[PDB]
Design a protein around this ligand. Structure first.
Ligand SMILES: [Mg+2]
Length: 464
């Protein structure tokens, strides 16, 4: 090997190197984004036990749906912003027209089979704008009612008036108004959840604001013994290899009121935390700007989940008694796959999305790391967390944290209460054996309940 002479050069101060690295990642967002963003997402999802339990905002959107399946998030928001730049510029159609035709057809299927047409005109003439009242109530929910008074008087906020954009973005960049920007983008997610709920048909449910019991009420009413349940597994399908998926989410976001001034605010805010790469610290800071992007990513992922179901199922989704969506997980009641349905899923995404047929009682439907089982005493269907996935998750080595250990124990205590319902334990062990081809899980249910009983017993999981 013949190498040319290597002569390196450096800056006079390490702080100049820190700023250069942060400025580079800031200047090249959203073209590239560090995988530490999605890695911080995964660390937060795994900590709070799944997507539905990842609701800890000041104002959201009785425990939540807790899943032990490890998270593998992808920066869907970054790809949406990339599609916004390729659309604002690049008027030259470099075969982005077939991407445009595909995304247009996706929005067509989404509207035809999953939506009403009542609110599209209102959202077009009234884009999403966050008012002074929300951002003041947002800070009041965190730092007290008085700190919200200083919040409004510091940034000169007028009551019952939309927060002017010139207060936190100019020349863009967040101009030292970090708590105002974070407050604004928390209201965008709240309005996006409210507006999506308004357009979706009543038989189509998104699990943003839904407790475990409130979701069980929907399951108990619509899911009976012998009822077929369809499932579209999209977890293995990467959205980045479809520019139409990112363009589809962008169009639906725009259809909901995310106009160009809003996208510029979103791209500017999330290009700023990409400039918080260095210094790293010892652990993820788990900030509110990080959470806002996770929820926006989760929102777009959930919408694209409904889109995929709308195009594949067509009228079968519209006539379904009950269809639930959150993240990439979904169940659709009373639909059995056919040849024309499996073909549409094949010629569209190849063999990247599968169709799973399940029945209440014999082939247990799976949803958010849990089984849809029917109680053998009340004959009412419900969702029961996967005990095998919980056992796998409990093997993760963790540093000592007495507060988080109590949260993990109380979360396991709640899961064991559902496992030992006298009408659940039998059919649960049948479901685990049916799904995983393993031996009877009941002795593990016994052992897991031992750990959850007391704080002293939970210590045996970590040991000494
Ligand atoms: Mg549109």
């Amino acid at each position: 090997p013949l190498y040319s002479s290597s002569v390196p050069a450096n800056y006079s101060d390490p702080q100049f190197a820190v700023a250069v690295c942060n400025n580079y990642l800031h200047e090249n967002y959203p073209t590239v984004a560090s995988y530490q963003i999605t890695d911080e997402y995964d660390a937060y999802l795994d900590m709070v036990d799944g997507t539905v339990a990842c609701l800890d905002t000041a104002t959201f959107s009785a425990p939540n749906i807790r899943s032990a399946v490890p998270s593998a998030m992808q920066n869907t928001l970054q790809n949406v912003l990339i599609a916004a730049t390729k659309r604002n510029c690049n008027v030259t159609q470099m075969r982005e027209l077939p991407t445009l035709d595909s995304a247009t057809f996706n929005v067509e299927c989404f509207r035809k089979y999953a939506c009403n047409d009542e609110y599209w005109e209102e959202f077009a003439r009234k884009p999403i704008r966050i008012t002074t009242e929300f951002v003041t109530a947002y800070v009041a929910r965190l730092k007290g009612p008085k700190a919200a008074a200083l919040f409004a008087k510091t940034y000169n906020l007028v009551p019952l008036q939309e927060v002017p954009m010139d207060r936190f973005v100019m020349d863009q960049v967040i101009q030292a108004a970090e708590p105002l920007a974070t407050a604004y983008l928390c209201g965008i997610h709240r309005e996006l959840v409210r507006r999506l709920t308004a357009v979706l048909l009543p038989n189509i449910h998104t699990l943003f604001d839904m407790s475990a019991e409130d979701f069980d009420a929907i399951i108990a009413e619509h899911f009976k013994q012998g009822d077929p349940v369809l499932e579209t597994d999209i977890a293995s399908f990467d959205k980045s290899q479809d520019d139409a998926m990112a363009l589809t989410g962008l169009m639906i976001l725009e259809d909901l009121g995310v106009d160009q001034p809003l996208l510029d605010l979103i791209e500017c805010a999330f290009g700023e935390i990409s400039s918080t790469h260095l210094p790293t610290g010892t652990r993820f800071k788990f900030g509110a700007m990080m959470k806002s992007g996770m929820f926006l990513t989760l929102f777009v992922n959930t919408v694209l989940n409904v889109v995929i179901a709308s195009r594949v199922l067509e009228e079968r989704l519209k006539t379904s008694r009950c269809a639930a969506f959150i993240g990439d997980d979904n169940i659709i009641h009373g639909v059995v796959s056919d040849k024309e349905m499996a073909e549409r899923c094949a010629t569209w995404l190849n063999m990247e999305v599968k169709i799973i047929d399940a029945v209440i009682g014999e082939r247990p439907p799976y949803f958010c790391g849990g089984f849809i089982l029917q109680d053998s005493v009340t004959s009412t269907a419900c969702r029961v967390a996967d005990p095998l996935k919980r056992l796998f998750k409990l093997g993760k080595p963790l540093p000592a944290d007495d507060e988080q250990d109590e949260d993990r124990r109380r979360a396991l205590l709640d899961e064991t209460k559902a496992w030992f319902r006298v009408g659940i334990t039998g059919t649960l062990a049948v479901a685990v054996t049916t799904r995983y081809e393993v031996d009877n899980i009941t002795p593990v249910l016994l052992a897991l309940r031992t750990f959850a009983q007391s704080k002293r017993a939970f210590q045996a999981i970590r040991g000494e």
